[PDB]
DNA sequence: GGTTGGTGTGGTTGG
C-alpha cells in the first residue's frame, strides 16, 4: 500500500543547513496535499509546512525564509531544506501524505541543533 | 493506535 520513509535526520551546529527527504511509495505527491510537522522536547506538536497536488506552498511563521519544500516527481520525494538551523528548531520532524480518506505517516526524524 | 506523539478527539489533521 502506501508508506512513507523520512531520512536526514541527525546533529547539526546552530546556523547550519540540512536537508530532510520524504519518499512515498503506492501513492504520488503529485496526487494529494502532504504536510511537516515537528514536534520539539517540551511542546505539542506543530504545522511547519505544506504542499498541495499541484506544488504550492505554505509556511509556517517560524520557519518562513529559513525552511524551504521542493519536489522530485520523477523520484516521489519531497525535500525539506531547513537553513538558519537554531537550537529552537530541536524536534521530531514528520512529513505526511493524504490519499483518499486516509492520512499515511513517516516514521519521524530526530533533528538536533546544538546552541552556538 | 494507527502507517505517527502525546498534556491522545485538537492540532493549518478524523475519530
Ligand atoms: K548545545
Ligand atoms: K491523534
Known amino acids: 500500500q502506501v508508506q512513507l520513509q523520512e531520512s536526514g535526520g541527525g546533529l547539526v551546529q546552530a546556523g547550519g543547513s540540512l536537508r530532510l527527504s520524504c519518499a512515498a511509495s503506492?501513492?504520488?505527491?503529485?496526487?494529494?496535499?502532504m504536510t511537516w510537522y515537528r514536534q520539539a522536547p517540551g511542546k505539542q506538536r506543530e504545522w511547519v509546512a505544506t504542499?498541495?497536488?499541484?506544488?504550492?506552498?505554505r509556511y509556517a511563521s517560524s520557519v518562513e525564509g529559513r525552511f524551504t519544500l521542493s519536489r522530485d516527481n520523477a523520484k516521489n520525494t519531497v525535500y525539506l531544506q531547513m537553513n538558519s538551523l537554531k537550537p529552537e528548531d530541536t524536534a521530531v520532524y514528520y512529513c505526511?501524505?493524504?490519499?483518499?480518506?486516509?492520512?499515511?505517516w513517516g516514521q519521524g526524524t530526530q533533528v538536533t541543533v546544538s546552541s552556538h
Open positions: 505526511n501524505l493524504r490519499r483518499g480518506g486516509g492520512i499515511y
Open positions: 503506492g501513492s504520488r505527491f503529485s496526487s494529494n496535499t
Open positions: 504542499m498541495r497536488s499541484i506544488g504550492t506552498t
